[PDB]
Amino acid sequence: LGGYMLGSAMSRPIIHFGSDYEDRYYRENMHRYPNQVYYRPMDEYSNQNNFVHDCVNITIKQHTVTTTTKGENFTKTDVKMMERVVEQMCITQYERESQAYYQRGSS
Numbered sequence: 001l002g003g004y005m006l007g008s009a010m011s012r013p014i015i016h017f018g019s020d021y022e023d024r025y026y027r028e029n030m031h032r033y034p035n036q037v038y039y040r041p042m043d044e045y046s047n048q049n050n051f052v053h054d055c056v057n058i059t060i061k062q063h064t065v066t067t068t069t070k071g072e073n074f075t076k077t078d079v080k081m082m083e084r085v086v087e088q089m090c091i092t093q094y095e096r097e098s099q100a101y102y103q104r105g106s107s
Helices: 020-032 048-070 076-104
Strands: 005-007 037-039
């Protein structure tokens, strides 16, 4: 956080971990799971891999600090699903910035 941007809630991505046990666990904890991510402007060699990668670590590292002190509790299992759910959320924002970068033209 600091030199990044924040994207408001959109839609909690659907992830598949082990089986129905974990599936229903996360699905029932979506309300306690963050739906916002932190994305940064596109740099040299515009790629979705680097965009989402850097977005995942910051998003989880950010919520675990404030959200866990705002009225939540992210444990080992919480960060696990968060990693997968945030990764998808980062891709969504990737297209959001890619639409403005592609329309920006050659500047």
